[PDB]
Amino acid sequence: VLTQPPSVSAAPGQKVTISCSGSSSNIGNNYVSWFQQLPGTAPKLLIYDDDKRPSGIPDRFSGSKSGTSATLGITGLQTGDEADYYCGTWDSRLSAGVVFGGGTKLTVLGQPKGAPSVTLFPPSSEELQANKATLVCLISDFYPGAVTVAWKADSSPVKAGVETTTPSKQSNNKYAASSYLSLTPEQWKSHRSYSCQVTHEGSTVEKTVAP
Amino acid sequence: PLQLGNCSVAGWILGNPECESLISKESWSYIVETPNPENGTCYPGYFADYEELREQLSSVSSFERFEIFPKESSWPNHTVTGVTASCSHNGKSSFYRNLLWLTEKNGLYPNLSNSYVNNKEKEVLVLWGVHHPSNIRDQRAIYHTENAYVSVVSSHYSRRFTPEIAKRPKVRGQEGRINYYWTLLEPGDTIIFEANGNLIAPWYAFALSRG
Amino acid sequence: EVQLVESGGGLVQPGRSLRLSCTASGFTFGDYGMSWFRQAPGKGLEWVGFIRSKVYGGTTEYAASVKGRFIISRDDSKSIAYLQMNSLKTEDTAVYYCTRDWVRDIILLPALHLDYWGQGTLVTVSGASTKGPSVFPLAPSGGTAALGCLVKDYFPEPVTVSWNSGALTSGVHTFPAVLQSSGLYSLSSVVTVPSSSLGTQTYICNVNHKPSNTKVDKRVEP
Ligand SMILES: *[C@@H]1O[C@H](CO)[C@@H](O[C@@H]2O[C@H](CO)[C@@H](O)[C@H](O)[C@H]2NC(C)=O)[C@H](O)[C@H]1NC(C)=O
């Protein structure tokens, strides 16, 4: 198997290179291909035959190989380039077949801070009819994906019923999140204020709903 | 009289896949060709001493085709199943029925040394080829060696071959070349093939008495 | 253009079998090799196997992970490649993709020219039973209003949420599901619209959970 740097960080407009070290069996003597895979999408062929580009790949992407290691270069760094990058090749050993690298997540630095847009829905009419009640807090469009979510019930911090996503990535390249607080319709109406305190880079947005 | 139909002397003596239905005969006065036989060297390259070969095969009193190096037994440490889309047969890729494209096996191309002894009490016609890939990345992928040598040693034929990489104009969809060489082996003489890559080894030869 | 469409994924018990399918369009299918790749959730790309074109023998190569258990075949009459999986184990759970590829000429290796991929299909090798989802509307109150749908307590993934039957990509965002203490998934979809456009028109979310054959269309009203 091939070895890649787990993470690579570079500011926009800079030269950025991803390493992919192998052996004489796989990378030394076989062709290397590079792939871009944005979060939750089919991989995209960037480079094949160690430096060739398929149709639609801009000139900013280039590949090179020297001995047992191969390298991919991205020269004009965009925020759209923030994705995962894989190196693949054939391993001529008896039955190693196609082998890949562990993957490399490229993060573009200098991206503007993004405040999280929070939406908190109360339990709906139909769900209350079903003797259940889920409060859905949605958080999206924040670039620094380091949010802290905290539920509170009439100023009291609650522990039971909270389940939270881990930050996602969408077509805005900013992160997205969601957190559900499970409760009986009774806990819903025994209080009058449930809040969704979302703290992101010190400052905290919170929304409050009500039976 | 020997009717090659729509095949050149090269395509018939090398075993072009699209000339297998040519009725073999052990004695002929001369060779009948056509204005331009459709099937010659399906893989492009220079046929060394072609005119001298056509003269040597002009008339023959004895002509037997025999397997000089058995495919399943001669190269255990090399890959033997090489085929090309240029030498196709029934719409599927194949190769010359008298040659063998040796490539790397399990990431290795060990030094080979194969001897043949002329025990036929006749002179045998032996044909082989030297592969000239179009780029170094193909040389690595096919053979896993960068500095290849090919040598042939007999009493009356001895030559060190020059497997040079060179991108040539695309002919029959190929930018690489196979240079074909041959020699007549006297009774009792021993020809020895030695290579670490790029050898199109003889599969079948021809014992002939040349009336 | 080139387009590869896959199907067949779903819930399957360990030791059972499941046949994936990958339909090709927009190119001469018989002139290309085909490869299957897989990717466990958030765990990188893996190679499953590869089938050469008929011009190069139509033979197959398989990863050591898989060789004895999966079988890859192709049907050039229908331009479809299959991934017949047998003796499935839990570690076989992954999103499976199909690709077209070149067959290198002399050495017959895959050229790794994976220029086109399918959307992938999720295969869950599990022993738990399928559970359909509950769908509840998320009613709305800048000058915008947010409405959505709550897809609750389903197993297994995936669920496909559309808005007015796949027409609305404007202002839509479906969030990743969450696994609960009960082993059941649950996600939400939300759309943003002009607030005076609420008493104006319709907004239906179309939730589709194929593992349970569930198809629900829910209306979100103020
Ligand atoms: C191919 O390589 C094998 C090595 O696995 C060679 O087999 C060995 O050859 C040596 C000397 O020739 C013997 O002493 C061993 O007993 C052989 N077997 C093993 C398992 O080592 C074989 O000779 C090679 N073939 C050719 C044509 O060179």
Tab-separated table of N, CA and C in Angstrom, chain C residues 62-202:
chain	number	residue	atom	x	y	z
C	62	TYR	N	-8.900	-9.691	-9.414
C	62	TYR	CA	-9.580	-9.423	-8.156
C	62	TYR	C	-8.578	-9.058	-7.073
C	63	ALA	N	-9.025	-8.223	-6.141
C	63	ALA	CA	-8.227	-7.942	-4.962
C	63	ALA	C	-8.165	-9.175	-4.069
C	64	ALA	N	-7.055	-9.302	-3.335
C	64	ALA	CA	-6.938	-10.385	-2.365
C	64	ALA	C	-8.078	-10.349	-1.361
C	65	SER	N	-8.597	-9.155	-1.067
C	65	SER	CA	-9.710	-9.012	-0.136
C	65	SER	C	-10.896	-9.885	-0.523
C	66	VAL	N	-11.030	-10.207	-1.807
C	66	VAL	CA	-12.338	-10.473	-2.378
C	66	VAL	C	-12.342	-11.691	-3.300
C	67	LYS	N	-11.150	-12.115	-3.736
C	67	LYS	CA	-11.023	-12.952	-4.930
C	67	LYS	C	-11.931	-14.178	-4.888
C	68	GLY	N	-11.907	-14.916	-3.781
C	68	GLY	CA	-12.670	-16.149	-3.730
C	68	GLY	C	-14.172	-15.961	-3.659
C	69	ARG	N	-14.638	-14.785	-3.246
C	69	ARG	CA	-16.041	-14.591	-2.895
C	69	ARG	C	-16.839	-13.790	-3.911
C	70	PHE	N	-16.253	-12.778	-4.546
C	70	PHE	CA	-16.983	-11.971	-5.514
C	70	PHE	C	-16.613	-12.400	-6.929
C	71	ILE	N	-17.555	-12.219	-7.852
C	71	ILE	CA	-17.351	-12.538	-9.260
C	71	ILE	C	-17.841	-11.363	-10.090
C	72	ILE	N	-16.999	-10.897	-11.009
C	72	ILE	CA	-17.310	-9.770	-11.879
C	72	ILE	C	-17.569	-10.299	-13.281
C	73	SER	N	-18.680	-9.873	-13.874
C	73	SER	CA	-19.040	-10.259	-15.227
C	73	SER	C	-19.615	-9.042	-15.936
C	74	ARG	N	-19.713	-9.137	-17.261
C	74	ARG	CA	-20.228	-8.042	-18.068
C	74	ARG	C	-21.179	-8.592	-19.119
C	75	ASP	N	-22.113	-7.745	-19.547
C	75	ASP	CA	-23.084	-8.078	-20.589
C	75	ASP	C	-23.047	-6.954	-21.620
C	76	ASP	N	-22.299	-7.164	-22.704
C	76	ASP	CA	-22.175	-6.145	-23.738
C	76	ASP	C	-23.436	-5.999	-24.579
C	77	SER	N	-24.375	-6.942	-24.488
C	77	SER	CA	-25.648	-6.771	-25.178
C	77	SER	C	-26.478	-5.673	-24.525
C	78	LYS	N	-26.436	-5.583	-23.197
C	78	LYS	CA	-27.159	-4.560	-22.457
C	78	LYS	C	-26.250	-3.464	-21.925
C	79	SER	N	-24.942	-3.554	-22.175
C	79	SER	CA	-23.968	-2.565	-21.708
C	79	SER	C	-24.025	-2.418	-20.189
C	80	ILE	N	-23.904	-3.548	-19.496
C	80	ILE	CA	-24.010	-3.603	-18.045
C	80	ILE	C	-22.863	-4.437	-17.499
C	81	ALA	N	-22.274	-3.974	-16.401
C	81	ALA	CA	-21.293	-4.735	-15.644
C	81	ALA	C	-21.878	-5.093	-14.283
C	82	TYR	N	-21.619	-6.319	-13.839
C	82	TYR	CA	-22.170	-6.838	-12.598
C	82	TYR	C	-21.063	-7.103	-11.585
C	83	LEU	N	-21.434	-7.049	-10.306
C	83	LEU	CA	-20.557	-7.425	-9.199
C	83	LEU	C	-21.339	-8.417	-8.341
C	84	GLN	N	-21.146	-9.705	-8.605
C	84	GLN	CA	-21.815	-10.753	-7.841
C	84	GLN	C	-21.023	-11.002	-6.563
C	85	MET	N	-21.597	-10.628	-5.423
C	85	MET	CA	-20.948	-10.790	-4.129
C	85	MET	C	-21.541	-11.987	-3.397
C	86	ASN	N	-20.672	-12.848	-2.872
C	86	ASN	CA	-21.079	-14.006	-2.090
C	86	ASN	C	-20.303	-14.025	-0.779
C	87	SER	N	-20.855	-14.736	0.205
C	87	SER	CA	-20.201	-14.944	1.498
C	87	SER	C	-19.834	-13.614	2.151
C	88	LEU	N	-20.781	-12.681	2.118
C	88	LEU	CA	-20.515	-11.330	2.588
C	88	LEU	C	-20.274	-11.315	4.094
C	89	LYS	N	-19.321	-10.491	4.520
C	89	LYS	CA	-19.060	-10.252	5.931
C	89	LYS	C	-19.290	-8.779	6.242
C	90	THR	N	-19.344	-8.468	7.540
C	90	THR	CA	-19.644	-7.102	7.961
C	90	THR	C	-18.623	-6.105	7.427
C	91	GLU	N	-17.356	-6.508	7.316
C	91	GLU	CA	-16.341	-5.602	6.794
C	91	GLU	C	-16.493	-5.342	5.300
C	92	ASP	N	-17.384	-6.056	4.614
C	92	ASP	CA	-17.695	-5.745	3.226
C	92	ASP	C	-18.646	-4.563	3.094
C	93	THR	N	-19.142	-4.028	4.210
C	93	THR	CA	-20.044	-2.884	4.180
C	93	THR	C	-19.295	-1.648	3.696
C	94	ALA	N	-19.750	-1.077	2.585
C	94	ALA	CA	-19.092	0.069	1.971
C	94	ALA	C	-19.968	0.575	0.833
C	95	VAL	N	-19.667	1.787	0.382
C	95	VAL	CA	-20.216	2.288	-0.870
C	95	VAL	C	-19.391	1.714	-2.014
C	96	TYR	N	-20.058	1.066	-2.962
C	96	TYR	CA	-19.392	0.434	-4.093
C	96	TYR	C	-19.595	1.276	-5.345
C	97	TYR	N	-18.496	1.608	-6.017
C	97	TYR	CA	-18.524	2.361	-7.261
C	97	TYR	C	-18.076	1.475	-8.416
C	98	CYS	N	-18.547	1.807	-9.614
C	98	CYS	CA	-18.101	1.156	-10.835
C	98	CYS	C	-17.463	2.196	-11.745
C	99	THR	N	-16.520	1.747	-12.570
C	99	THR	CA	-15.775	2.641	-13.442
C	99	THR	C	-15.500	1.955	-14.769
C	100	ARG	N	-15.258	2.774	-15.786
C	100	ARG	CA	-14.683	2.319	-17.040
C	100	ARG	C	-13.185	2.582	-17.010
C	101	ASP	N	-12.434	1.757	-17.732
C	101	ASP	CA	-10.982	1.846	-17.689
C	101	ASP	C	-10.408	1.327	-18.997
C	102	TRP	N	-9.191	1.777	-19.300
C	102	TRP	CA	-8.438	1.258	-20.429
C	102	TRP	C	-7.740	-0.043	-20.052
C	103	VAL	N	-7.577	-0.915	-21.040
C	103	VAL	CA	-6.754	-2.110	-20.907
C	103	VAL	C	-5.438	-1.848	-21.626
C	104	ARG	N	-4.337	-1.854	-20.876
C	104	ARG	CA	-3.026	-1.634	-21.472
C	104	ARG	C	-2.705	-2.752	-22.459
C	105	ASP	N	-1.935	-2.412	-23.494
C	105	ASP	CA	-1.949	-3.217	-24.712
C	105	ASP	C	-1.207	-4.539	-24.554
C	106	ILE	N	0.051	-4.503	-24.129
C	106	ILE	CA	0.848	-5.727	-24.105
C	106	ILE	C	0.746	-6.435	-22.762
C	107	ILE	N	0.839	-5.682	-21.663
C	107	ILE	CA	0.825	-6.278	-20.332
C	107	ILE	C	-0.584	-6.476	-19.790
C	108	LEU	N	-1.603	-5.952	-20.472
C	108	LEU	CA	-3.013	-6.182	-20.153
C	108	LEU	C	-3.394	-5.702	-18.755
C	109	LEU	N	-2.573	-4.854	-18.140
C	109	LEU	CA	-2.923	-4.280	-16.854
C	109	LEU	C	-3.999	-3.210	-17.032
C	110	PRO	N	-4.751	-2.906	-15.973
C	110	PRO	CA	-5.654	-1.749	-16.029
C	110	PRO	C	-4.855	-0.453	-16.033
C	111	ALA	N	-5.206	0.448	-16.949
C	111	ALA	CA	-4.477	1.702	-17.085
C	111	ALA	C	-4.824	2.710	-16.001
C	112	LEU	N	-5.811	2.410	-15.157
C	112	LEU	CA	-6.266	3.323	-14.109
C	112	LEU	C	-6.690	4.672	-14.690
C	113	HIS	N	-7.275	4.637	-15.886
C	113	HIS	CA	-7.885	5.819	-16.490
C	113	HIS	C	-9.360	5.896	-16.088
C	114	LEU	N	-9.576	5.980	-14.774
C	114	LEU	CA	-10.923	6.053	-14.204
C	114	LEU	C	-11.473	7.468	-14.389
C	115	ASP	N	-11.791	7.791	-15.642
C	115	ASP	CA	-12.292	9.123	-15.951
C	115	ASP	C	-13.765	9.292	-15.605
C	116	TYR	N	-14.518	8.199	-15.492
C	116	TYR	CA	-15.944	8.284	-15.217
C	116	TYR	C	-16.347	7.245	-14.183
C	117	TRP	N	-17.153	7.682	-13.219
C	117	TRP	CA	-17.616	6.849	-12.123
C	117	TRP	C	-19.135	6.894	-12.059
C	118	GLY	N	-19.713	5.854	-11.469
C	118	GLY	CA	-21.106	5.892	-11.095
C	118	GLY	C	-21.305	6.684	-9.818
C	119	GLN	N	-22.572	6.840	-9.440
C	119	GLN	CA	-22.880	7.514	-8.186
C	119	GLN	C	-22.621	6.636	-6.971
C	120	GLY	N	-22.464	5.332	-7.162
C	120	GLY	CA	-22.233	4.423	-6.062
C	120	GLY	C	-23.527	3.936	-5.433
C	121	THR	N	-23.429	2.787	-4.767
C	121	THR	CA	-24.557	2.206	-4.056
C	121	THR	C	-24.065	1.623	-2.739
C	122	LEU	N	-24.856	1.806	-1.686
C	122	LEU	CA	-24.459	1.392	-0.347
C	122	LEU	C	-24.875	-0.052	-0.097
C	123	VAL	N	-23.945	-0.850	0.419
C	123	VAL	CA	-24.189	-2.247	0.756
C	123	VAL	C	-23.952	-2.413	2.250
C	124	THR	N	-25.006	-2.769	2.981
C	124	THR	CA	-24.938	-2.954	4.427
C	124	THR	C	-25.032	-4.444	4.728
C	125	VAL	N	-23.923	-5.029	5.169
C	125	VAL	CA	-23.897	-6.423	5.597
C	125	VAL	C	-24.160	-6.410	7.099
C	126	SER	N	-25.383	-6.766	7.485
C	126	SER	CA	-25.814	-6.624	8.867
C	126	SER	C	-26.864	-7.676	9.188
C	127	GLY	N	-27.087	-7.876	10.483
C	127	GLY	CA	-28.038	-8.868	10.939
C	127	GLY	C	-29.273	-8.262	11.569
C	128	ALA	N	-29.326	-6.934	11.629
C	128	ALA	CA	-30.491	-6.246	12.157
C	128	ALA	C	-31.566	-6.129	11.079
C	129	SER	N	-32.812	-5.962	11.519
C	129	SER	CA	-33.934	-5.917	10.594
C	129	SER	C	-34.163	-4.500	10.081
C	130	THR	N	-34.671	-4.418	8.854
C	130	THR	CA	-34.990	-3.137	8.241
C	130	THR	C	-36.134	-2.462	8.985
C	131	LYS	N	-36.019	-1.148	9.170
C	131	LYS	CA	-37.070	-0.353	9.791
C	131	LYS	C	-37.337	0.866	8.925
C	132	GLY	N	-38.593	1.041	8.519
C	132	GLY	CA	-38.987	2.187	7.739
C	132	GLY	C	-38.955	3.457	8.562
C	133	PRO	N	-38.895	4.601	7.893
C	133	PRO	CA	-38.810	5.879	8.600
C	133	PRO	C	-40.172	6.500	8.874
C	134	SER	N	-40.198	7.340	9.905
C	134	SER	CA	-41.301	8.257	10.156
C	134	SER	C	-40.921	9.617	9.588
C	135	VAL	N	-41.853	10.250	8.882
C	135	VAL	CA	-41.605	11.535	8.241
C	135	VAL	C	-42.556	12.558	8.841
C	136	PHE	N	-41.993	13.604	9.443
C	136	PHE	CA	-42.752	14.694	10.023
C	136	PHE	C	-42.367	16.013	9.366
C	137	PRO	N	-43.318	16.915	9.158
C	137	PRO	CA	-42.983	18.221	8.588
C	137	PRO	C	-42.357	19.137	9.626
C	138	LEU	N	-41.517	20.043	9.145
C	138	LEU	CA	-40.904	21.072	9.981
C	138	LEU	C	-41.486	22.409	9.537
C	139	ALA	N	-42.511	22.864	10.247
C	139	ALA	CA	-43.283	24.009	9.791
C	139	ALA	C	-42.516	25.307	10.030
C	140	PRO	N	-42.572	26.250	9.094
C	140	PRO	CA	-41.924	27.549	9.296
C	140	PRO	C	-42.823	28.504	10.074
C	141	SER	N	-42.218	29.602	10.518
C	141	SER	CA	-42.931	30.630	11.273
C	141	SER	C	-44.048	31.254	10.439
C	142	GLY	N	-33.657	37.667	8.374
C	142	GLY	CA	-33.996	38.329	7.129
C	142	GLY	C	-35.447	38.147	6.730
C	143	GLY	N	-35.722	38.278	5.434
C	143	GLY	CA	-37.068	38.111	4.921
C	143	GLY	C	-37.320	36.720	4.379
C	144	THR	N	-36.572	35.744	4.884
C	144	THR	CA	-36.678	34.358	4.459
C	144	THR	C	-37.357	33.524	5.538
C	145	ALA	N	-37.810	32.338	5.136
C	145	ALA	CA	-38.421	31.379	6.044
C	145	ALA	C	-37.872	29.994	5.739
C	146	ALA	N	-37.625	29.216	6.789
C	146	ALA	CA	-37.039	27.889	6.668
C	146	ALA	C	-38.077	26.830	7.010
C	147	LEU	N	-38.255	25.873	6.105
C	147	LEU	CA	-39.157	24.747	6.297
C	147	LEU	C	-38.404	23.463	5.971
C	148	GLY	N	-38.876	22.350	6.517
C	148	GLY	CA	-38.144	21.119	6.316
C	148	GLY	C	-38.953	19.891	6.662
C	149	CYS	N	-38.256	18.754	6.676
C	149	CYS	CA	-38.852	17.457	6.955
C	149	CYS	C	-37.935	16.661	7.872
C	150	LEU	N	-38.536	15.951	8.827
C	150	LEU	CA	-37.813	15.127	9.790
C	150	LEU	C	-38.021	13.659	9.429
C	151	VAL	N	-36.950	12.999	9.001
C	151	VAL	CA	-36.964	11.577	8.674
C	151	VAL	C	-36.386	10.835	9.875
C	152	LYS	N	-37.243	10.142	10.622
C	152	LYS	CA	-36.915	9.665	11.960
C	152	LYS	C	-36.890	8.142	12.016
C	153	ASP	N	-35.843	7.598	12.647
C	153	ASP	CA	-35.792	6.213	13.121
C	153	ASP	C	-35.966	5.209	11.975
C	154	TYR	N	-34.978	5.203	11.085
C	154	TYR	CA	-34.924	4.241	9.994
C	154	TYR	C	-33.622	3.450	10.045
C	155	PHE	N	-33.640	2.284	9.394
C	155	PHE	CA	-32.459	1.446	9.252
C	155	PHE	C	-32.671	0.531	8.062
C	156	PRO	N	-31.664	0.343	7.200
C	156	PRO	CA	-30.393	1.061	7.280
C	156	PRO	C	-30.357	2.257	6.337
C	157	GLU	N	-29.199	2.906	6.242
C	157	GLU	CA	-28.995	3.912	5.217
C	157	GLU	C	-29.062	3.251	3.840
C	158	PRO	N	-29.390	4.018	2.787
C	158	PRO	CA	-29.636	5.458	2.780
C	158	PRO	C	-31.098	5.843	2.617
C	159	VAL	N	-31.373	7.126	2.818
C	159	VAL	CA	-32.663	7.727	2.520
C	159	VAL	C	-32.437	8.854	1.527
C	160	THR	N	-33.324	8.959	0.545
C	160	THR	CA	-33.256	10.004	-0.466
C	160	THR	C	-34.417	10.963	-0.250
C	161	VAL	N	-34.097	12.221	0.032
C	161	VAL	CA	-35.093	13.266	0.224
C	161	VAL	C	-35.097	14.159	-1.006
C	162	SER	N	-36.279	14.375	-1.567
C	162	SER	CA	-36.485	15.330	-2.640
C	162	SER	C	-37.481	16.381	-2.173
C	163	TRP	N	-37.550	17.484	-2.913
C	163	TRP	CA	-38.471	18.569	-2.599
C	163	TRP	C	-39.277	18.895	-3.846
C	164	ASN	N	-40.593	18.708	-3.759
C	164	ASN	CA	-41.489	18.787	-4.911
C	164	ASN	C	-41.010	17.860	-6.028
C	165	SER	N	-40.688	16.624	-5.639
C	165	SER	CA	-40.293	15.556	-6.558
C	165	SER	C	-39.044	15.939	-7.360
C	166	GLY	N	-37.961	16.189	-6.625
C	166	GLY	CA	-36.653	16.401	-7.218
C	166	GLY	C	-36.496	17.654	-8.048
C	167	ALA	N	-37.446	18.588	-7.977
C	167	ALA	CA	-37.365	19.789	-8.802
C	167	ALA	C	-36.527	20.872	-8.137
C	168	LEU	N	-36.646	20.998	-6.818
C	168	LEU	CA	-36.060	22.099	-6.066
C	168	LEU	C	-34.639	21.732	-5.642
C	169	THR	N	-33.645	22.326	-6.306
C	169	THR	CA	-32.285	22.374	-5.782
C	169	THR	C	-31.987	23.721	-5.134
C	170	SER	N	-32.788	24.733	-5.454
C	170	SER	CA	-32.680	26.032	-4.812
C	170	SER	C	-32.914	25.920	-3.310
C	171	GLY	N	-31.961	26.446	-2.537
C	171	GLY	CA	-32.122	26.616	-1.113
C	171	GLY	C	-32.335	25.348	-0.329
C	172	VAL	N	-31.968	24.201	-0.888
C	172	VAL	CA	-32.167	22.904	-0.248
C	172	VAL	C	-30.877	22.479	0.428
C	173	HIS	N	-31.005	21.833	1.585
C	173	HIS	CA	-29.867	21.156	2.188
C	173	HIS	C	-30.356	19.995	3.040
C	174	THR	N	-29.967	18.783	2.655
C	174	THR	CA	-30.220	17.584	3.441
C	174	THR	C	-28.970	17.257	4.249
C	175	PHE	N	-29.133	17.126	5.547
C	175	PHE	CA	-28.020	16.977	6.472
C	175	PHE	C	-27.679	15.503	6.677
C	176	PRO	N	-26.425	15.197	7.012
C	176	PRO	CA	-26.057	13.802	7.277
C	176	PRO	C	-26.842	13.237	8.452
C	177	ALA	N	-27.216	11.967	8.333
C	177	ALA	CA	-27.978	11.312	9.382
C	177	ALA	C	-27.115	11.095	10.620
C	178	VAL	N	-27.782	10.791	11.731
C	178	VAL	CA	-27.122	10.484	12.990
C	178	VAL	C	-27.536	9.087	13.428
C	179	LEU	N	-26.560	8.297	13.865
C	179	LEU	CA	-26.856	7.021	14.496
C	179	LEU	C	-27.206	7.247	15.959
C	180	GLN	N	-28.268	6.592	16.413
C	180	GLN	CA	-28.761	6.772	17.766
C	180	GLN	C	-28.343	5.594	18.641
C	181	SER	N	-28.674	5.689	19.931
C	181	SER	CA	-28.368	4.609	20.863
C	181	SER	C	-29.115	3.327	20.521
C	182	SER	N	-30.160	3.415	19.703
C	182	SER	CA	-30.939	2.257	19.288
C	182	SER	C	-30.446	1.650	17.982
C	183	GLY	N	-29.348	2.156	17.426
C	183	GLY	CA	-28.884	1.677	16.141
C	183	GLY	C	-29.703	2.138	14.960
C	184	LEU	N	-30.614	3.088	15.158
C	184	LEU	CA	-31.467	3.604	14.097
C	184	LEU	C	-30.969	4.966	13.633
C	185	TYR	N	-31.045	5.204	12.329
C	185	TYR	CA	-30.627	6.476	11.763
C	185	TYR	C	-31.797	7.452	11.716
C	186	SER	N	-31.456	8.727	11.559
C	186	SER	CA	-32.439	9.798	11.496
C	186	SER	C	-31.755	11.033	10.937
C	187	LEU	N	-32.366	11.658	9.936
C	187	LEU	CA	-31.824	12.874	9.356
C	187	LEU	C	-32.938	13.895	9.167
C	188	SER	N	-32.546	15.073	8.685
C	188	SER	CA	-33.475	16.147	8.369
C	188	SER	C	-33.067	16.789	7.054
C	189	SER	N	-34.064	17.296	6.339
C	189	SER	CA	-33.867	18.106	5.148
C	189	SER	C	-34.559	19.441	5.362
C	190	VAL	N	-33.947	20.513	4.870
C	190	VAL	CA	-34.475	21.854	5.073
C	190	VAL	C	-34.359	22.626	3.767
C	191	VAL	N	-35.310	23.528	3.544
C	191	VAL	CA	-35.278	24.415	2.387
C	191	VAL	C	-35.631	25.824	2.840
C	192	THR	N	-34.972	26.808	2.233
C	192	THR	CA	-35.177	28.219	2.526
C	192	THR	C	-35.926	28.872	1.372
C	193	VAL	N	-36.953	29.653	1.699
C	193	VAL	CA	-37.840	30.245	0.701
C	193	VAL	C	-38.245	31.630	1.136
C	194	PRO	N	-38.697	32.477	0.214
C	194	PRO	CA	-39.299	33.757	0.597
C	194	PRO	C	-40.528	33.539	1.472
C	195	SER	N	-40.600	34.289	2.575
C	195	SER	CA	-41.656	34.052	3.558
C	195	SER	C	-43.042	34.384	3.016
C	196	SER	N	-43.170	35.402	2.157
C	196	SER	CA	-44.477	35.637	1.551
C	196	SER	C	-44.826	34.590	0.501
C	197	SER	N	-43.916	33.663	0.196
C	197	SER	CA	-44.184	32.576	-0.737
C	197	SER	C	-44.704	31.320	-0.037
C	198	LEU	N	-45.128	31.436	1.223
C	198	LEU	CA	-45.596	30.282	1.987
C	198	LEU	C	-47.084	30.021	1.767
C	199	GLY	N	-47.935	31.003	2.081
C	199	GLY	CA	-49.316	30.945	1.636
C	199	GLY	C	-49.474	31.050	0.139
C	200	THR	N	-48.353	31.149	-0.568
C	200	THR	CA	-48.348	31.307	-2.012
C	200	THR	C	-48.459	29.951	-2.703
C	201	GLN	N	-47.511	29.044	-2.440
C	201	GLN	CA	-47.449	27.794	-3.199
C	201	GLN	C	-47.276	26.532	-2.356
C	202	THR	N	-46.978	25.426	-3.033
C	202	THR	CA	-46.831	24.111	-2.428
C	202	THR	C	-45.374	23.829	-2.079
